[PDB]
Design a binder for this molecule. Structure first.
Ligand code: CA
Ligand code: MG
Ligand code: MG
Length: 430
DNA sequence: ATTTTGACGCT
């Protein structure tokens, strides 16, 4: 009752660039705009692996992870842009730099947590308070929310998508109590106004469109963001949670898409997030551990406390390459040459990072996979990263991994290596 | 033969 927390203390948004690598390539090459197109890495093996797909091409069934040759079977007019290749490997610099463009714009509005190359959480609580004080009891016009969906509306006593969107927004705004500045629904609504402004600024200043979710925590904001894509934003209120979760597969909630969510489904014999409400906190802790159990107990009620962390920059800078099938590295010279390629890309990115961001990495992590091992990484070792020098870093990585070679032959490497991975970590201010 | 990333939890 009067003491039960409701998780309505913050306004949190999640902003997600639509088909991001595709938009970067479409901005650069106008011939690709408004066409079925995809971004592909490499080209020799089956036309290359697709890593991003425009919504026009998704309509044909083209997906990420698909080989371009197969996608062309679904979509014969599919246009393709290739990721740059440098030093023998795919090089993602263009997309990292485009990401910085967008994150710097978002940071003008509020504190952001970089969640991936194309998405960030936004803590809007303070910005909403200030905007509410500026408004001075003035109602919020639908014109301030031209791309916003209110999840769960319209309801109760038009057959077009935009007409439905507007009907629901009208019902929401008609019900709103705009004179209580502490009202969580009003706070979410002002948050959505700010996110419309943020998304307009991103599009004006970069050309890139994005979607967004606005709710009271990160998990609900992330879920909301996916409800109406592309180029739209969705407000998920606390009150919408019971209906939304009542048919929501557990795997759709962030962190439950893998083994833990599978165990929740199997052990409890349920399918939907809302079904979790029927268990006590102790029951859930008994099955899934103290932390996970408490988290699930709160989350199925719409409540999550994970903070938006103030972190706009990645914590690690890494470079990796797979060597599948017959290309697995089987000689020492091969291993050393590719460690050098990876180390040279790493040195370039690290020097740029030091100049831009006033920090230096202090640890070098070396990871390899051996042929036959099902795990993505077979071995991980660390060593000191004391100089931004590619020859030193590659020599050090070889030193820490050279004892993995079973081969009694000096020149040969066995078992063959199917993956090399160098990662700079443990940054310190510089 | 997806590939190339990135963050965080466990012990
Ligand atoms: Ca995206
Ligand atoms: Mg995606
Ligand atoms: Mg994303």
């Amino acid at each position: 009752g009067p003491h039960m927390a409701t998780g309505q203390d913050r306004v949190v948004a999640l902003v997600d660039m639509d088909c991001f690598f595709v938009q970067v390539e479409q901005r650069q090459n106008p011939h690709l705009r408004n066409k079925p197109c995809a971004v592909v890495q490499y080209k020799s093996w089956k036309g290359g692996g697709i890593i991003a797909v425009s919504y026009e091409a998704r309509a044909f069934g083209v997906t990420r992870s698909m080989w371009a040759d197969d996608a062309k079977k679904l979509c014969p007019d599919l246009l393709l842009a290739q990721v740059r290749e440098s030093r023998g490997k795919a090089n993602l610099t263009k997309y990292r730099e485009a990401s910085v463009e967008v994150m710097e714009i978002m940071s003008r509005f509020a504190v952001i947590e970089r969640a991936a190359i194309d998405e960030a959480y936004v803590d809007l609580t303070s910005a909403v308070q200030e905007r509410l004080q500026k408004l001075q009891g003035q109602p919020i016009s639908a014109d301030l929310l031209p791309s916003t969906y209110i999840e769960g509306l319209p309801q109760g006593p038009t057959v077009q998508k935009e007409g439905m969107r507007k009907q629901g927004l009208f019902q929401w705004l008609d019900s709103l109590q705009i004179d209580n500045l502490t009202s969580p629904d009003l706070q979410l609504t002002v948050g959505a106004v700010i996110v419309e402004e943020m998304r307009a600024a991103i599009e004006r200043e970069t050309g890139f469109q994005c979607s967004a979710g606005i709710s009271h925590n990160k998990v609900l904001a992330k879920l909301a963001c996916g409800l109406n894509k592309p180029n739209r934003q969705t407000l998920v209120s606390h009150g919408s949670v019971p209906q939304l979760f009542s048919q929501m597969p557990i795997r759709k909630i962030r962190s439950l898409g893998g083994k833990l969510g599978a165990s929740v489904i199997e052990i409890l014999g349920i399918e939907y997030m809302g079904e979790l409400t029927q268990f006590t906190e102790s029951q859930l802790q008994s099955h899934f551990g103290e932390k996970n159990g408490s988290w699930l107990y709160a989350m199925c009620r719409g409540i999550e406390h994970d903070p938006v962390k103030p972190r706009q920059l990645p914590k690690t800078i890494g470079c990796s390459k797979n060597f599948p099938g017959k290309t697995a590295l089987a000689t020492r010279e091969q291993v050393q040459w590719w460690l050098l390629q990876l180390a040279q890309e790493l040195e370039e990115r690290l020097t740029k990072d030091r100049n831009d961001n006033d920090r230096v990495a202090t640890q070098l992590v070396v990871s390899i996979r051996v042929q036959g091992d099902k795990r993505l990484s077979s071995l991980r070792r660390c060593c000191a990263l004391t100089r931004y020098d590619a020859h030193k870093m590659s020599h050090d990585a070889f030193t820490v991994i050279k004892n993995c070679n079973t081969s009694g032959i000096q020149t040969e490497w066995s078992p063959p290596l199917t993956m090399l991975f160098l990662c700079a970590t443990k940054f310190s201010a510089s």
